[PDB]
Symmetry: C3
Amino acid sequence: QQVWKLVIITEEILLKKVSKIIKEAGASGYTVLAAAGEGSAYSNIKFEVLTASRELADQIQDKVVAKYFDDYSCITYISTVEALRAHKF
Amino acid sequence: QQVWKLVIITEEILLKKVSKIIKEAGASGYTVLAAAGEGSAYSNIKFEVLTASRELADQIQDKVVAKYFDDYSCITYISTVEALRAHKF
Amino acid sequence: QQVWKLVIITEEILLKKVSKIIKEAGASGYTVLAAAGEGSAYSNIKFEVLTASRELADQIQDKVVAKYFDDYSCITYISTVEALRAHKF
Ligand SMILES: Nc1ncnc2c1ncn2[C@@H]1O[C@H](COP(=O)(O)OP(=O)(O)O)[C@@H](O)[C@H]1O
Ligand SMILES: Nc1ncnc2c1ncn2[C@@H]1O[C@H](COP(=O)(O)OP(=O)(O)O)[C@@H](O)[C@H]1O
Ligand SMILES: Nc1ncnc2c1ncn2[C@@H]1O[C@H](COP(=O)(O)OP(=O)(O)O)[C@@H](O)[C@H]1O
Ligand SMILES: [Cl-]
């Protein structure tokens, strides 16, 4: 049984705004790490959001991209994982 | 040639206990990152353990879940990677 | 459409040297996280580099391994992701 993992790497100023999008979309949780990077090196944030459906991962990704992709640094992608143990998913 | 990657995100108080489980099971190493998150946002820890067999990844995951899943925050999952270069695996 | 994700976990002293290899090879960016670990627990660094081709991921991995694998702690691997949104890739 595959589940989906959405990653969003973006500017630290978006921590609250992106966390709200994740929770309002119905994700059961999220993990965020402090990171740094260079793109198109400075401190930024990396979100990981596990979802039971591709649709939910897409909905979160699409909302973040629609709101912030044009005005903020951002990279995002999805992959699959298995053998999930979670308290509420 | 695929190898396995076990992820365990759990409470920081379990750092030593989970590290011991990983090493006693025979993993060749582990990586741990400081993180934060929300689940079922506060600081926590994310372990990544690469293993040569699914069996070893399962054994570590099963022991952590059996010991701590009922009493501590925890999410865990497995995925595959390739092109491994490691000193001892 | 799959894209590739190269991970390199290595000693913090190599931060600049590995960042230079990544950029000189033509990657569009990279992310780096502070981590800790044990191998063959101390602070180290984890790079993640997304690439449009397996060839580019291999070229970066091969250069890092050729330069530093014999003299420094290092583990590296590759996996795939999808649903990429990036500003320049
Ligand atoms: N090819 C890549 N591999 C890994 N991480 C990347 C890559 N490209 C961008 N990133 C990450 O995403 C962040 C944002 O990138 P981007 O939106 O291109 O603008 P910026 O150059 O301001 O970082 C970077 O700081 C980096 O952390
Ligand atoms: N759907 C999810 N996606 C990403 N990370 C998650 C998810 N659910 C939980 N987590 C991570 O696992 C941690 C533990 O979650 P959980 O055991 O549900 O309880 P808690 O609410 O105390 O965090 C969270 O703090 C978060 O880091
Ligand atoms: N099996 C593994 N799973 C996850 N991370 C690992 C594993 N083996 C090594 N690592 C990571 O790579 C780093 C370097 O490992 P290695 O080169 O074997 O030497 P060291 O023992 O000096 O760390 C470790 O500190 C750890 O972060
Ligand atoms: Cl990570």
